[PDB]
A and B are shown apart, each in its own frame.
Chain A
Amino acid sequence: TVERAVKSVDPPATFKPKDEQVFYPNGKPNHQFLKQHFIHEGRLHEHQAIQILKQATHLLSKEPNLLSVPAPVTICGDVHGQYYDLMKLFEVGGDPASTKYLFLGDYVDRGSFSIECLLYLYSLKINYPDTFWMLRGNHECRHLTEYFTFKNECLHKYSEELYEECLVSFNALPLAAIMNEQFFCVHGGLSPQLTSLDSLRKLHRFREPPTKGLMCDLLWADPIEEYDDDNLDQEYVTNVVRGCSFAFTYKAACKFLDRTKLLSVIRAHEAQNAGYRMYKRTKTMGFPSLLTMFSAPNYLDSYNNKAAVLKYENNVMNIRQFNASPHPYWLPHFMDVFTWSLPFVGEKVTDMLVSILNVCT
């Protein structure tokens, strides 16, 4: 009655840790604390979470549109707030204290632990700003977080002020990276306006992504479904599936790689049953022209897909896969049980109160 009916279930940690636990004496977030605290569904004081958002925004806003990421590095695809799979990812990819990381975006939406994923990743960024890097994906913007789950999540767990602060940090995320002077890394893919790498360097990126143009395409582009068949002469085609942007062909990737003297394109953005996918090999050097990474296993609790990260070194692409891990339950829209049950309580009670009333003519 006052004890817990299901004692094998761990209870959530506190929604109010002290400042001395969330931050190291130097004022940077204590990521080892936040890792365990978020595993147990603990929350922060709002001012603590805003502090982490503001320090990450400050670091990110100083980086260029197009990062330079040296090898060895672990490259990761989508997370989508699947915080308990993110814990496994770090196990597979290496300890951030001695492993370089490059995330390709889509940290938020769909999973019920987006703000934990985002605050945790940012606390790594802040503590390891020279070895830990994060690109923007197409979900790191106002339009999609409004349409999917992340805004409802911030409003439920924190406030709209925090939601606005996250948007500021999304607009500051870099768009792409050159990894080891060999790979173009981006969330979506190529663009008809990606004439040179300078086209990307000249963009004003601190904004919501446009309806169309370079910045939209980097976040939204896919390869054509028949990309490996290589039976199209065009470089770019209208992406009906996404309802914006373009799908690009093997010919577009090869001309781009030749122009920029690069080996391959590494991106994410599309779910993969195997966690990754290597596409048709380059006629110039033999490397895969394209690689898709996807780091969200059992996507949406229903795909039963593996996830993968890429551990790149010595000109070797070590693909490391992992399966899904269990996570706690949330109602849709982060409803509490009173919000969830009270409409039904009222229906069921009223029904009885009307039968009791209608017993007499």
Chain B
Amino acid sequence: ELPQIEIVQEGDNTTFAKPGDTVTIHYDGKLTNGKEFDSSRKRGKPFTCTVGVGQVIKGWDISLTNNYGKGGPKISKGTKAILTIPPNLAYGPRGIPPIIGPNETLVFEVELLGVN
């Protein structure tokens, strides 16, 4: 099981995130019906994390590190993308209430602003 990645605009094609790197991202998250559940851009602080270590949902690790080198679409710095993430790679049947319901598929519109 993998997440679906659709490249909206591309970046440098050179700077790809690898496991253990940090990234900086502006994301809007919404459900398949379009209802938005969060946006970093509205909060004014870009999200920063360490990818590939399980410090985020599995869909983000797989998307940002190219499934740790075993694809089946890479994301470079400056790429604006859309990640469609199935519930098993997100918040499963439990969900994060009240912000994410059960068995929900998540669609993140991410812009990779920086790596390291």
Contacts and interface: CB of A to CB of B under 8 A. Distances in A.
Interface in A255-278: none
B70 interface: no
A148 B31 CA distance: 12
Contacts of A302: 39, 41-42
Nearest to B43: A301
Nearest to A146: B35
B96 A332 contact: no
A148 to B, nearest CB: 8
Contacts of A343: 96
The 4 closest A-B pairs by CB, nearest first: A301-B42, A302-B41, A333-B99, A332-B38
Interface of A is mostly: helix
Contacts of B43: 301
A339 interface: yes
B68 interface: no
B69 interface: no
Nearest to B95: A343
Interface residues of B, number: 12
B37 A332 contact: yes
Interface size band for A: 10 to 19
Contacts of A333: 37, 98-99
Nearest to B97: A339
Contacts of B39: 302, 332
B72 interface: no
A197 interface: no
12 contacts: A147-B35, A148-B35, A301-B42, A302-B39, A302-B41, A332-B38, A332-B99, A333-B98, A333-B99, A335-B98, A339-B97, A339-B98
Nearest to A339: B98
Interface in A286-336: 300-302, 332-333, 335
B79 to A, nearest CB: 20
B99 A301 contact: no
Interface string A133-177: 000000000000001100000000000000000000000000000
Contacts of B37: 332-333
A73 B35 CA distance: 37
Interface string A183-205: 00000000000000000000000
Contacts of B35: 147-148
Given A333-B37, A339-B98, 12 more contacts: A147-B35, A148-B35, A300-B42, A301-B42, A302-B39, A302-B41, A332-B37, A332-B39, A332-B99, A333-B98, A335-B98, A335-B99
A148 B35 CA distance: 7
Interface in B72-116: 96-99
Contacts of A148: 35
Nearest to A155: B98
A88 to B, nearest CB: 19
A301 B96 contact: no
Nearest to A331: B99
Contacts of B99: 332-333, 335
A332 B98 CA distance: 10
A301 B44 CA distance: 8
Nearest to A148: B35
A343 B95 CA distance: 10
A300 B39 CA distance: 10
Contacts of A147: 35
B15 to A, nearest CB: 25
A333 B37 CA distance: 8
Residue of A147, A300, A332, A339 contacting most chain B CB atoms (<10 Å): A332
Contacts of A301: 42-44
A332 B42 CA distance: 10
